[PDB]
Design a protein around this nucleic acid. Structure first.
Ligand SMILES: [K+]
Ligand SMILES: [Mg+2]
Ligand SMILES: [Mg+2]
Ligand SMILES: [Mg+2]
Ligand SMILES: [Mg+2]
Ligand SMILES: [Mg+2]
Ligand SMILES: [Mg+2]
Ligand SMILES: [Mg+2]
Ligand SMILES: [Mg+2]
Ligand SMILES: [Mg+2]
Ligand SMILES: [Mg+2]
Ligand SMILES: [Mg+2]
Lengths: 325, 567, 140, 198, 101, 229, 49, 132
RNA sequence: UUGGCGGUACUUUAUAUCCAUCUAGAGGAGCCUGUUCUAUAAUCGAUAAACCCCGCUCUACCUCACCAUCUCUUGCUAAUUCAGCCUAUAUACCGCCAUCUUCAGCAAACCCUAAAAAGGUAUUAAAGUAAGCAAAAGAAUCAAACAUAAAAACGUUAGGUCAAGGUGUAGCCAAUGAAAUGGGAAGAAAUGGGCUACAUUUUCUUAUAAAAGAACAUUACUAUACCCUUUAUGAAACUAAAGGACUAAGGAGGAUUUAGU
């Protein structure tokens, strides 16, 4: 008994009407955009809505949407009993009919395997589904203790002898682990009008950006912005930074590089070239060497950039003096 | 590129379900409150102009600036009089003109004529306006005309026109005689007013009257004055009085119009139609065929406003089509309205609803139901909101096509147009639905419609204590409930015959009994007997005997039934 | 309309003059807006409109501009506490080529009249003409 | 006793799926939930809630909709607008071909903004660009023309740029730049006695 | 009624400087050069002084158009920081948002 | 200036000073000034067709007009009367019955309990208050928090009755909680011939002794005021 | 032009086409203040003679 | 604590609309701009004049439709045209709206010397985004 | 039965922090700037943390609210025995904020208790439940992350602001209102913050931060002071900049304190 509106819940009759309007919505949206209604799809709908209702709101949940009711409306709002009031599932009164119905099946499988009576690593590089994924399969809220108990039961199933039916079952709750390989992506090897091989790669340090063009065969002649490298870089430390890629792979005096660095200062421009050269030099080295470069810092872009000044303090971190009290 | 939206009201009306005109009254009332707010705003702007004078619009917009109508020239000079004449003030200009004469300062004949034009046209009365007329023998116009030292053709011409406009036909003709005696020459506009005068005056002999009007035309050629469209339009409008004898003269005029080179306008045909197709025409046996020829002549042509009766043509043409019961001609007339921008000459508010009402009524009568329903969606509501009689014609058409499945939908449409509480319409909907039997699905649909029409009676009864349920609707609503799986509701409605003291019909009473036999409920069968006894209907006794044989009556029922039989 | 359709719609009068027409080598249309999505819809509408009239069009996105300024948060004192505000301007350049003067007026009118609210245009016509008759021949 | 008016059902219900939508939205109008037959929703949704509906939606009203501009309308619109367009001369099929016959390039700028005033000060400026190769200039003339114009001449492109914004209107600034070219050209050909002392 | 008596005085200063703009331009031109005799320049130095003080355009102060606040005004909108924040924080200024970066 | 004018909601918010440092830790009354104003009505007395007067009268399309000085003075005085009458209406109220005293809640009817889950109305039941305690505890919200404990009883006068305690921070909430809780704890009391107990009853509940006696008809209820209720 | 806005809106309020919640708020505070005897004195008849 | 344009929490009984619920930092993220003109774009003029005209147009519409506005109005300037889009409660009779539309449009077109149109969407009652 | 604070000083805890570690400063000199004090005919407010380059992203006149002197009395508006009021109370308030604070709580409606002043957890589970607000998430810094910004409820300080504006109550209406002219001064003073120098990792010059040639302790380094010229803005130079000399002190700054991962 409060002014806050009563819980808004959706019946099967309500969602059913929301799906008829959506189906009639598609036929109108198709007629607007001049497309054929039969083939009009979810992808075309989202594109049409973006043209007819251009919104530049940064958060995409707040933009106009004409989606199917299944997506927008919470799925876990379906009638669980009939007209006579008798629930449909024998575990209705537990409050977690779907979680306990699943724990009922897995416990019955375990009993038959134990009564009836090889390597268990049938699948590798897989993980157990996270609670958020499980909650989606069950379509009901689970607690952290409920998730832990389900996994322990599934593990016990794997320990026991498993027929092909059991392996398919546990597969449903095994999700492929992401295979993000931190391995450098080698650039192609183009050919010049003369016919010499060369690779190109970009590099960015602070505000400086470089575009190197390493040549497979050379005597070590580096030209920066159409100038020599001793002239362009009068500082010793800046030249050393250009030496690091080649010296590491013992490839000094074997390549001819032509660089074009714009932006930043003297040190930031040398660093930008170093990464650009290291990435272009990848095409002319063995894969074992490319990994050696990656593990020495030569292929990682440096993310350190100047931080903004903050209002009310002298600098990015420097604070105004705390006046003597 | 764009066409009319069939599901939208006219663009003038605000696009909102709450603000869309339901009926024809709200259509006119909504366009009179809008104009009222426009006039309220212009009053504030024209009364406190200092607040609406800053101009920030480049280029400058003249029509969004305050208007000033009061003279700002204070000195009494011929120039100041000219300002008042330009501003169209009649009394102020007369005062300053007389003051100029009192001083004796020279006044140009052209300026004195601009004063007479204003006075003659407004007939000595201030221009009509809104804020928080026969010719008078003693008036400023005639007095100023006499004071004029030097007279010219225009001066006499202005007097002749102002007199005719303000119903001074006899005097205007006398003024024209003076113009001839002075040997001056009139203009086309003055000749048109003189012809309008002879016609309006009632001459005992038409042959003399016609020969007189022709004499004015003969003096138009002696003075080398060429006629215009209005000249011929005026003559034909006068001929509409003598329908019988004006037919041959009227055709002769139109042939002369083309030879001269004047192009007949929509107004010129509007007059010939009236003269050949009289509304009060007893001789309908053999109507004239001229309307067919005109439509062929005007087929595909585009027309522009060139007279003051152009709008009248389309409304008159549709009327003649309905009288002749020719739907092919109605399509040609409507097709002409669609060519180019002819739609602009359909007519104003009084005549726009007559044209389409006449048109749509003709469609339903003489058009296939499939085509009739296409026109129904196009014209309504976008073009016009129809009155209830339009729906009675539509429902009658549905009945003639054996498509009564659509009667429930027509009712829902009718409610939007303010026919929800119309007694005649509610009686027609129920009548057609319950006139004959139907398949179970159709009967169930009609039953839902019957429930909706019942709610209108119930809600109406709640508002009005002195409410009467007409007898026929009661029978129709009860029958439909029995036939469509709503028998329980029909038994409750049986009591309403007694509450309103309406005499149940013999057919309805026996129908209730038939349903009772299938149900097998003797109690329900005896309930019918109770109502028959109330109104002392003779069949009630026979019905009671019928119940005795139809059902086995318990001893308690025998005593109760016997009492009712005695009653 | 299902059965009721105009018969001979009236069309505007276009009269060919005897004056020669302007020749625009290039015509750059720089539209500006706070919202990128609006530019995408206008970019689609303008590119589709150009293609339908036979005009040659290219599109690129000039770098966006963001202007930031600081204000004082409190009505009184409390200097160190500020509030910052920004305005973002986004650009879409429609580079048209080889347009006569009649084609550039009708196209610009059509797309200028349909310019959404909050969008500003900057047309930069580039006309090409012959040399002045005096300059053609050196005269002393 | 007082009677409150009842709103009619939205006219979207009466709209067919094969309607002529261009007729529904002829020109730019605000989003009208009673005229747009689409179940569109907009708004960040509350927890366990869906985005708000179209009816009474201020966010959808704040959007500059393109319902008036649909692919079906635009094609029907441009079809009518074809009679206005004129054909570009086929011979001028390349940029170099244009420089051959029409060496003079005149830049003029228009500006479109929202407000009561159509005035922009930047619209008066005009810029003339001509290549000296296109001009008939003797070896003496070209050297004199390049010294007089100063930084207006670009050696890399050999283009002379005359920008005139001093006059109030665009027709005056345009006529002035053409004038500047004639005097510079004719003066360059003229030879003065003091020039022999270079 | 303007916001306060200070805004009214400034409004008059702005309307009298517009009246005397041409005059103060022509006379002041005679002084901002080295081509005319110093006797004439000294005399124009006195004609400019003789014009009314409110004709001088350096006595105009930019004040918030809605609250007549002398300082804290933003010239692009002619509003004080306090009034500008009320309109910006409510979505009433077209394109103004908070700066997060 | 027209630009320094604020809305009514903000003007009353400031004047009332409800949210303030003094209010929370320790009289002005709000008024609505648009209550009697009819759109289109001004001091000058202009008449606007379609806004404050009929658009059409006796078939005549009306035009703008203004009321005379005498007519307008009547309208101003009439509205002043209606405003004064509205103030009288605010003062007026329908007196309800007191309980065992005039300033106490004991014995006061608060109506029937609220409807049930499936439209189970309880119009046949009456609710009576027996004790109302305003007790203060010590929570950080106010330092010393506020609490209202309400004991109520319900019965249909036909043998079924129950009691419950409802606690809340607001008295109105404590009434609802107690009133709807008691409907779930309905005892059925056996009455001899519908007017008295079947036999003498003597009992001690904790330190409270009750001693009831069966009596003949017409004797009435001679009992503690709470027992009579 | 602050005079144009203040004057125009004041005129509209007297025609009944505009409602100033602020002014009605002030109009009633003066009415109540005058009843309490704290109303504005007449010019030339102030407390000081 | 920041007090700017925040409808503070009550005890779950205050009905806030979508516009009212979102604080200033959600501008351009979850909620858009009520006025859309070209005067705050880069290298554009007359920001001061567009902002002042909006302030007046908002006070004018409130007084002209007193108690009949369900939410803040939306102002759209295209070329010299001004468009006012307001959600209005269905309190007043229909014909009264036709008067106020004709009056408010004509008056505002002669005051700012631009074409002004009023677009009114009628709601049965204020739309509540959440109860706070 | 609760709430509190007492000496919660005890165990873990903070993370540019309490001490320790590290770097550059402040504390000394010269100036710039705020405040207090003295003081003037001459604003006001802020004034421990959470004031002191604060309202001011800005005072030669204007700004201006201050003081002296002279003047106006229906005195901005359509109307009004009305206009106007920076007049007192931020201890009547709105509005917009500081603070604890990127702290983690605030918790409505129901249900249960051998009566409840209150409480309501156990997961191999024992009476709690299904929803909000903040956090998280999301979005912004235009790949990705991280980081930074932004966000941070309820209370605490009757904290700050009637002088952004609006407003309750009380006060002034020939004056506490309006306008004009000219002033709103200073320091053998204390203190907060900033700036420059004290030099050799330096000074000057050319390049450019590469390299080179000179200077290098009595004025070598070293005056954003005073003074002297020219110049820009302005009606007004009392302002700012650029030169010119004049050049004094200062030789790296006690206890002590600020910022930075
Ligand atoms: K406060
Ligand atoms: Mg630093
Ligand atoms: Mg200044
Ligand atoms: Mg008492
Ligand atoms: Mg204070
Ligand atoms: Mg001063
Ligand atoms: Mg002064
Ligand atoms: Mg004062
Ligand atoms: Mg992110
Ligand atoms: Mg967060
Ligand atoms: Mg004073
Ligand atoms: Mg000077």
């Amino acid at each position: 008994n409060v002014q806050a509106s009563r819980q808004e819940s959706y019946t099967e009759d309500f969602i059913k009407k929301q799906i008829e309007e959506f189906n009639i919505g598609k036929r109108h949206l198709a007629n607007m955009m001049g497309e054929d209604p039969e083939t009009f799809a979810e992808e075309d709908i989202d594109r049409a809505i973006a043209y007819l209702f251009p919104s530049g709101l940064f958060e995409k949940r707040a933009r106009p949407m004409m989606k199917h009711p299944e997506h927008i409306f919470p799925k876990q709002r379906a009638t669980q009993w009939g007209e006579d009031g008798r629930p449909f599932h024998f575990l209705f009164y537990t409050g977690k009919q779907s979680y306990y119905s699943l724990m009922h099946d897995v416990y019955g499988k375990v009993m038959q395997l134990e009564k009836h009576r090889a390597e268990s690593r049938d699948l590798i590089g897989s993980r157990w589904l996270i609670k958020e994924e499980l909650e989606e399969m069950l379509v009901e809220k689970l607690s952290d203790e409920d998730y832990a108990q389900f996994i322990r039961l599934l593990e016990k199933l794997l320990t026991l002898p498993c027929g092909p039916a059991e392996e398919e079952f546990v597969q449903r709750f095994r999700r492929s682990v992401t295979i993000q390989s931190k391995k450098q992506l080698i650039e192609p090897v183009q050919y010049d009008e003369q016919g010499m091989a060369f690779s190109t790669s970009e590099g960015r340090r602070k505000s400086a950006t470089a575009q190197a063009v390493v040549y497979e065969h050379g005597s070590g002649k580096i030209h920066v912005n159409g100038v020599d490298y001793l002239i362009y870089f009068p500082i010793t430390q800046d030249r050393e930074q250009l030496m690091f890629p080649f010296h590491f792979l013992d490839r000094l005096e074997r390549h001819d590089v032509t660089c074009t660095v714009s932006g930043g200062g003297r040190s930031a421009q040398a660093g930008a070239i170093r990464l650009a050269m290291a990435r272009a030099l990848c095409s002319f080295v063995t894969e074992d060497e490319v990994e050696w470069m990656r593990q020495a810092g030569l292929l990682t872009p440096d993310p350190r950039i100047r931080e903004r000044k903050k209002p009310g303090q002298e600098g990015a971190r420097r604070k105004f003096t705390w006046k003597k009290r | 590129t764009v066409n009319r939206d069939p599901t939208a009201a006219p663009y003038v009306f605000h696009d909102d379900p709450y603000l869309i005109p339901t009926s024809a009254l709200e259509s006119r009332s909504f366009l009179l409150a809008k104009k009222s707010g426009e006039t309220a705003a212009k009053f504030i702007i024209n009364s406190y102009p200092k607040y609406f004078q800053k101009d920030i619009a480049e280029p400058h917009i003249p029509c969004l600036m305050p208007e000033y109508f009061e003279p700002q020239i204070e000195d009494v000079s011929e120039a100041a009089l000219e300002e008042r004449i330009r501003l169209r003030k009649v009394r102020a200009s007369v005062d300053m003109f007389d003051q100029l004469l009192q001083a004796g300062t020279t006044v140009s004949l052209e300026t004195t004529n601009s004063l007479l034009d204003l006075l003659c046209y407004y007939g000595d009365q201030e221009p009509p306006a809104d804020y928080p007329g026969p010719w008078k023998a003693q008036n400023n116009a005639e007095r100023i005309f006499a004071l004029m030292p030097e007279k010219n053709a225009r001066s006499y011409c202005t007097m002749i026109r102002g007199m005719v406009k303000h119903r001074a036909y006899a005097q205007a003709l006398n003024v024209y005689t003076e113009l001839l005696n002075n040997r001056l020459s009139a203009d086309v506009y003055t000749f048109n007013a003189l012809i309008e005068a002879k016609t309006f005056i009632l001459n005992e002999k038409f042959e003399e009257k016609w020969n007189d009007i022709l004499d004015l035309l003969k003096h138009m050629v002696a003075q080398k004055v060429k006629p215009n469209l209005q000249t011929f339009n005026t003559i034909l409008k006068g001929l509409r009085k003598c329908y019988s004898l004006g037919r041959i003269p009227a055709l002769q005029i139109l042939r002369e119009m083309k030879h001269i080179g004047i192009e007949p306008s929509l107004a010129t045909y509007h007059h010939i139609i009236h003269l050949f197709y009289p509304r009060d025409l007893s001789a309908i046996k053999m109507p004239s065929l001229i309307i067919y020829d005109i439509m062929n002549e005007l087929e595909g042509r585009t027309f522009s406003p060139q007279d003051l009766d152009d709008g009248r043509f389309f409304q008159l043409a549709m009327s003649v089509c309905s009288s002749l019961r020719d739907l092919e001609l109605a399509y040609q007339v409507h097709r002409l309205l669609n060519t180019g921008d002819n739609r602009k000459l359909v007519g104003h508010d009084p005549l726009r609803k007559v044209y389409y009402s006449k048109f749509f009524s003709l469609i339903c009568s003489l058009e296939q139901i499939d085509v009739t329903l296409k026109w129904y969606k196009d014209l309504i509501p976008s073009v016009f909101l129809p009155h209830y009689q339009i729906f009675i014609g539509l429902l009658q058409a549905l009945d003639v096509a054996n498509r009564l499945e659509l009667v429930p939908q027509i009712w829902k449409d009718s409610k939007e147009y303010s026919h929800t509480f119309r007694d005649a319409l509610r009686e027609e909907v129920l009548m057609l639905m319950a006139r004959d039997k139907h398949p179970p699905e159709l009967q169930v649909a009609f039953a839902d419609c019957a429930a909706d029409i019942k709610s209108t009676y119930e809600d109406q009864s709640a508002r009005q204590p002195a409410f009467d349920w007409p007898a026929n609707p009661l029978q129709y609503i009860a029958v439909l409930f029995l036939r469509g799986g709503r028998s329980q509701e029909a038994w409750k409605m049986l009591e309403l015959f007694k509450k309103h003291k309406k005499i149940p019909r013999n057919e309805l009473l026996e129908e209730f009994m038939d349903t009772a036999k299938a149900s097998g409920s003797t109690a329900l069968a005896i309930e019918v007997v109770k109502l028959a006894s109330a109104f002392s209907l003779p069949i009630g006794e026979s019905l009671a005997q019928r119940v005795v044989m139809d059902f086995t009556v318990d001893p308690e029922q025998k005593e109760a039934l016997g009492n009712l039989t005695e009653l | 309309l299902h059965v009721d359709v105009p018969k001979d719609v009236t069309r505007p009068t276009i009269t060919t003059s005897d004056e020669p027409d302007t020749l625009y080598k290039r015509l750059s249309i720089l539209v500006k807006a706070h919202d990128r999505a609006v530019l995408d819809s206008y970019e689609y509408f303008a590119v589709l409109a150009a293609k339908e009239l036979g005009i040659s069009i290219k599109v690129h996105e000039p770098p966006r501009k963001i202007e930031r300024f600081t204000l004082l948060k409190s009505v009184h004192i409390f200097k160190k506490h500020r509030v910052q505000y920004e305005m973002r301007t986004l650009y879409r350049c429609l580079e048209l080529k080889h347009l006569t003067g009649s084609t550039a007026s009708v196209y610009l009118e059509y797309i200028q009249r349909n310019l959404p609210e909050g969008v500003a245009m900057e047309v930069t016509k580039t006309q090409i003409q012959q040399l002045p008759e005096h300059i053609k021949e050196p005269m002393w | 006793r007082p009677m409150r008016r009842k709103a009619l059902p939205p006219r979207t219900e009466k709209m067919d799926t094969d309607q002529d939508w261009p007729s529904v939205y002829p020109t730019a109008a605000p989003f009208k939930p009673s005229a747009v037959p689409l179940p569109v929703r907009m708004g960040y949704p509350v927890k366990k809630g869906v985005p708000m509906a179209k009816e009474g939606n201020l966010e959808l009203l704040k959007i500059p909709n393109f319902l008036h501009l649909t692919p079906v309308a635009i094609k029907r619109h441009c079809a009518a607008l074809k009679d206005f367009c004129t054909e570009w001369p086929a011979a001028l099929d390349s940029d170099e071909k244009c420089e051959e016959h029409f060496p003079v390039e005149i830049d003029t700028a228009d500006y479109v903004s929202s407000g009561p005033s159509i005035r922009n000060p930047k619209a008066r400026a005009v810029t003339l660009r001509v290549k000296l190769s296109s001009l008939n200039l003797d070896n003496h003339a070209k050297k004199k023309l390049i010294k007089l114009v100063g930084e207006r001449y670009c050696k890399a492109t050999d283009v002379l740029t005359i920008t005139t914004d001093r006059c109030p209107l665009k027709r005056q600034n345009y006529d002035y730049a053409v004038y500047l070219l004639t005097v510079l050209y004719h003066e360059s050909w003229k030879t003065e006695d003091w020039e022999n002392s270079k | 009624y303007y916001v306060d008596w200070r805004m009214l005085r400034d409004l008059k200063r702005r309307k009298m400087a517009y009246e005397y703009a041409d005059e103060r331009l022509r006379i002041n031109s005679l002084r901002k050069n080295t081509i005319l005799p110093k006797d004439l320049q000294e005399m124009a130095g006195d004609e400019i002084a003789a014009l009314p003080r409110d004709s001088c355009p350096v006595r105009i102060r930019n004040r918030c158009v809605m609250t007549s606040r002398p300082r804290g005004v933003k010239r692009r909108w002619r509003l004080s920081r306090i009034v500008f924040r009320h309109l910006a924080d409510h979505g009433l200024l077209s394109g103004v948002q908070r700066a997060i970066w | 200036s027209f630009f320094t004018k604020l809305t009514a909601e903000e003007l009353w918010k400031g004047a009332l000073a409800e949210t303030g440092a003094g209010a929370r830790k320790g009289k002005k009354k709000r008024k609505d000034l648009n209550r009697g104003q009819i759109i289109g009505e001004g001091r000058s007395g202009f008449l606007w067709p379609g806004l404050n007067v009929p658009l059409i009268k006796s078939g005549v399309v009306q035009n703008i007009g203004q009321r005379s000085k005498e007519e307008q003075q009547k309208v101003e005085a009439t509205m002043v009367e209606q405003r004064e009458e509205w103030d009288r209406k605010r003062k007026i109220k329908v007196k309800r019955e007191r309980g065992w005293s005039g300033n106490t809640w004991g014995g006061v009817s608060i109506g029937p309990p609220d409807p049930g889950p499936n439209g189970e109305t309880y119009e046949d039941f009456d609710t009576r208050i027996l004790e109302v305690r305003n007790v203060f505890n010590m929570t950080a919200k106010e330092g010393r928090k506020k609490s209202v404990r309400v004991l109520v009883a319900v019965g249909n006068g036909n043998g079924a009755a129950g009691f419950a305690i409802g606690k809340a921070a607001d008295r109105g909430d404590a009434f609802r909680k107690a009133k709807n809780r008691a409907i779930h704890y309905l005892h059925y009391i056996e009455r001899y011939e519908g007017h008295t107990i079947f036999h003498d009853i003597s009992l001690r509940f904790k330190r409270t002794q009750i001693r009831m006696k069966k009596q003949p008809r017409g004797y009435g209820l001679r009992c503690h005021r709470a027992i009579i209720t | 032009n602050h005079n144009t806005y203040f004057a125009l809106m004041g005129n509209l309020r007297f025609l009944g086409l505009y409602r100033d919640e602020h002014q009605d708020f002030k109009d009633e505070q003066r009415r109540l203040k005058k009843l309490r005897g704290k109303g504005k004195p007449r010019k030339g008849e102030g407390k000081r003679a | 604590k920041n007090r700017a344009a925040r409808v503070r929490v009550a005890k779950g009984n205050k009905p806030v609309s979508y516009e009212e619920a979102h604080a200033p930092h959600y501008i351009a993220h979850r909620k858009g701009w009520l006025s859309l003109h070209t005067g705050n774009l880069d290298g554009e003029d007359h920001a001061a004049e567009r902002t002042l005209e909006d302030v007046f147009l908002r006070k004018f519409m409130m007084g002209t439709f007193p108690g009949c506005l369900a939410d803040q109005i939306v102002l759209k300037r295209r070329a010299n045209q001004v468009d006012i889009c307001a959600l209005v409660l269905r309190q007043l009779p229909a014909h009264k709206f036709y008067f106020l539309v004709g009056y408010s449009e004509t008056l505002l077109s002669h005051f700012y010397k631009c074409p002004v149109r009023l677009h009114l969407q009628t709601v049965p009652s204020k739309v509540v985004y959440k109860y706070i």
